[PDB]
Design a protein around this nucleic acid. Sequence first.
RNA 1: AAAGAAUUUAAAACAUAUUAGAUUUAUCUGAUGUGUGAGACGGUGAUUUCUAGUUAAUCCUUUAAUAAUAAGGCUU
RNA 2: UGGAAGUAUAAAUCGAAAAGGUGAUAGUAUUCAUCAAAGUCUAAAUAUUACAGGAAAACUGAUAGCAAAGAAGUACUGUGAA
RNA 3: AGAUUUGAGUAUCGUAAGAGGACUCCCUUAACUUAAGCAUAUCAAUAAGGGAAGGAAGAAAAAAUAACAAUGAUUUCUUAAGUAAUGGCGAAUGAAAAAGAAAAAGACCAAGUUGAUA
Lengths: 148, 267, 89, 216, 204
Amino acid sequence: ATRFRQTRRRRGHVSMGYGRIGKHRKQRGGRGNAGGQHHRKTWFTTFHPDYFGKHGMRVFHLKANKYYCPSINVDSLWSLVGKDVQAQYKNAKVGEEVPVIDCVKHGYFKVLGKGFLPKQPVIVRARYFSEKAQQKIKAVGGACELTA
Amino acid sequence: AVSNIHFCKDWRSKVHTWFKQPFRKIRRHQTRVEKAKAVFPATIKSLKPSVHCMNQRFNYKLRLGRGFTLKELRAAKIDKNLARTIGIAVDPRRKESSKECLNRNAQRLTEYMNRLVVLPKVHAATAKRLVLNKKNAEAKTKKAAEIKKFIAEHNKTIKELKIKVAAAKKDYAKELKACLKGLKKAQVAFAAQVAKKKTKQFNKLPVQQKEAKQVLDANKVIRLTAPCTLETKTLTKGMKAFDAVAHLRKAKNVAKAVSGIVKGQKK
Amino acid sequence: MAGIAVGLKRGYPVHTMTAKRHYGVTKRKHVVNDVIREACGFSAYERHMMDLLRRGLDKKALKYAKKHLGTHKRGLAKRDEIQRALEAI
Amino acid sequence: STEAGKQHSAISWGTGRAVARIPRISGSGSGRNGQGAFGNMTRKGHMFSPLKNFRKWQRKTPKQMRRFAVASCIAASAVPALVSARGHHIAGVPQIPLVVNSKSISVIKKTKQAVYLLKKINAYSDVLKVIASKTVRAGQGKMRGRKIKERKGPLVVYGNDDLQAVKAFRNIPGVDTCRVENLSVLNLAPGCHMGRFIIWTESAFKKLNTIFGTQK
Amino acid sequence: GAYKYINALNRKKQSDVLRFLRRIRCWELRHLPRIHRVARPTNPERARRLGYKPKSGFVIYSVRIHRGNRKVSARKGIVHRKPACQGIHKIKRVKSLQAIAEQRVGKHCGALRVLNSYFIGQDSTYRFFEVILVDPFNAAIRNDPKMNWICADKQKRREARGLTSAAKKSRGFTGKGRRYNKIGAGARGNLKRRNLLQLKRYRS
RNA sequence: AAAGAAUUUAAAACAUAUUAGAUUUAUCUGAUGUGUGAGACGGUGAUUUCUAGUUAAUCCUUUAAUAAUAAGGCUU
RNA sequence: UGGAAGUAUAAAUCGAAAAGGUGAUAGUAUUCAUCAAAGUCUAAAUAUUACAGGAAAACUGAUAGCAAAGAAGUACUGUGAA
RNA sequence: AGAUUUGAGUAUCGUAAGAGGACUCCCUUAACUUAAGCAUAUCAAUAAGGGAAGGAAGAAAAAAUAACAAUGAUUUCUUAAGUAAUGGCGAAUGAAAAAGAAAAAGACCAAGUUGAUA
């Protein structure tokens, strides 16, 4: 769409939208992030203050597969199995069958506690549990299993 | 945003346009088409195991490795020299990792070997394997009669309780524990009796003359994982009082406490 | 039920399964060693290391085996070999 | 060509010779030695930024919006006001979502049968427009092979079992066919206009509910 | 056997027996021409390990190479370079002495193929090897299924392209793993592949 | 002191005692039982929380686990 | 070299083994996991703007497109590379 | 005189040479340029010089990853990723296992053994 640019409307203008007093010379302060501490310090100070420096230790060969731990809050636990299955087991109690929301199958390892769970007993099976997540599941009348 | 663009080096000579991609797809597809034509078990993509993935991030998803270990081919009663020639890969390098991986693959071979149908090494009807088949029909028929007899007297009990629990589950989904409790006691006795037993070193290659029904690959007729439906459990009183978080904070703290034990006993 | 994800005892409950084959030499290697040891003798650094061990300077024989071999675990294995030949005369 | 215009070895003469500073060819004894060089404004020099073959020729599009445009070009082919405004002669057709029995299609093997087909359902008032209005292209198109610039005619969206009838409709001027699955905006809406005259078949018409689904 | 004692003997290169034996050979090869075929190998346990078999078509060539580094070849030690590249001494070649000597025998005897080479001795000034060459066109080499692979065209000048055991190490092909990331399948064939800017057809 | 069945049928390391064939040296090679490493029982209990006593460790890391030297982190 | 108390190659000195290497923070010790270097060969998936034979084109249409739509690397210049 | 070893000449049958190097495997310690100067660094396995081959070449069967509900030759593509790291920690340089696909094939010498030895 080169008929939509500014060059097609700026034909006939001598300076071509770049000024006469200060022309469009090649460089306007180095090439790239040059002058980070000399004459563009007012940029890497106003817009990236912590750019220059060192902070934190060095991980020589980081293994990003051991920090991987997706999390699901309690309020979203029932959406893994659905809203039809939730209503079907809405009157269950201790002794009768209740669905097991196997979080590890869906790709969520940790289970965090945020928001409110519906007042139905439920079984949750996941690798890691949060302290306030277990209370939220148990206070509703459920169970907290572990896997792997 | 501070730019990070690696164009300072030479790049116009380091480009790789993909204009051959429309024609690569055709070139390969006209190879498989002209490879199954030569001999169809050439493109059959010889059977591969069912192995888990490495690392704890994918340690629950199965995928096809390469080659069955020497322990699986012996457990599934297959010759290692013959297995390579009947569309089964072999990986002598791989070491067995679990007794569950040994059974899971040993069933994969057994199911495939029952589907396999090998044509005679020589097409003519006077082949020795075809000749030896008619020469041993009398012995084969007797063997099938005694195998069938003692395969039914031993399962005379596992059949009925498994029938009861399967039938009793129909009423509950329109008592059950009684049928399940009885089945558990029967299977325990069966397991003990087997231990309280040499067999064939090898099974027989299924060799027959049949119609040539040609299938491009063999890993797509034996599914990796059985389909998974919603899993439901009985919510007892024991599971309502399982302190899951307290267990995680106990297993972790034990691991951090192995340093204190060594420091204490070194003084 | 399905193990725990932390601690020393960690992982899904399975039945893991390997021989720790020892890569050693045969009994005739005690003959091939003395056949060539008799013909060749000792190096210019093994003979001086024998002097230190005769005078009881056991440690300085190690610090001289390490200087000429560059590995602590290959200095002990050579000091013992040298001192096992001193007791064989 | 990457090395087009820049195959010379010219170095600027410089100031002090009463000539401009554009590079000039070396040597002597030829009408070219001493002339202008690489600069974009000279003769036999490289142009402005030379066109490189690795530009972006093909474009991408999300699938759920590519299929949105097909359902809006099919939907506008059932409106005779839009179809007529597009340059189609649908004055005499019985129904603008025109269908034909799949049994009638199965007997079609020669083009004189497909032509008789198009006449029977009164769809030949449009095919004759393509025949009677075929003219040459204007400009440099003819230098490169494109000489004849026809018009558009009815689209015969056949189905799975109407495959042997393709060879009949495929030679009539301005009758383009396309399978029901392979429908795209390039077929139902050529030149960005909408409301293409579609002549379905029974097999294709009764599949549109399976392929496209409904609103619920 | 009689060869598991020779192999164990040849590992004691500091023995008084070998140091005297290598002293004579290093004297003999100093006065003989630089590259000259010797009848039979002088380290036959090492000769027969690298591939040599006493059959027709196999020959043994001895190459003497002057060890020690050399100055950067610039006149009078004058280099018009920035202080980073202003050194002259202490610049070590990448290709070993083995590969360098191997390439000299291949050029001199161009009709044969270098199979491998080994070490024989050294003194304060020289270093002497022994190259095991193969005559591809000999009927015994062609008709042996385990060695006729050397008659293939791509094995012409095996050592100038870096294919032998000695010249492959100088390319970094000693082991495997993450220590050899940059030499996974060739030092330069890997580098070009990583630095490629793949522009798909339907790109964002 | 109070609540707590724990999931289910195809096996390799060889730590062990016994034999058979050999060796003389910093001695090996085979094979047969055993447990090891074992998991399928409201009441028992594996297991976790609480209350005080005692011992041991205690800012984080060196990415298979520990240790004492070393090095790297955070604040000033 | 991204490889950081040294990832790879080479040179000078030194230089093993009743084997051992790796587990990228140097060191020693005890376990554990996985392999077993210092010889060789091996089709298939891959690359290409030498060159030759083809097909295409939202490409240029004689100051454009290769430098060349005609006896073009030809006429012409230089001792010479050019 | 004879039995060997080593080194030559002559004759017969064959072999390398040169052209090409777009793609392939390599030897070499360039600079303009960037750092708003500049000297380490970037340009840079880049230009030039030099060697060798094929229709493809290079690699190839673990002294490899990993810390797992474990994988398993090599090559090529997607992703990891402008990430871990390196750097007058400045400008800038920058991978790999895991996971998804194309293709899938493994075999030999030396050492060891059998010697009325071939």
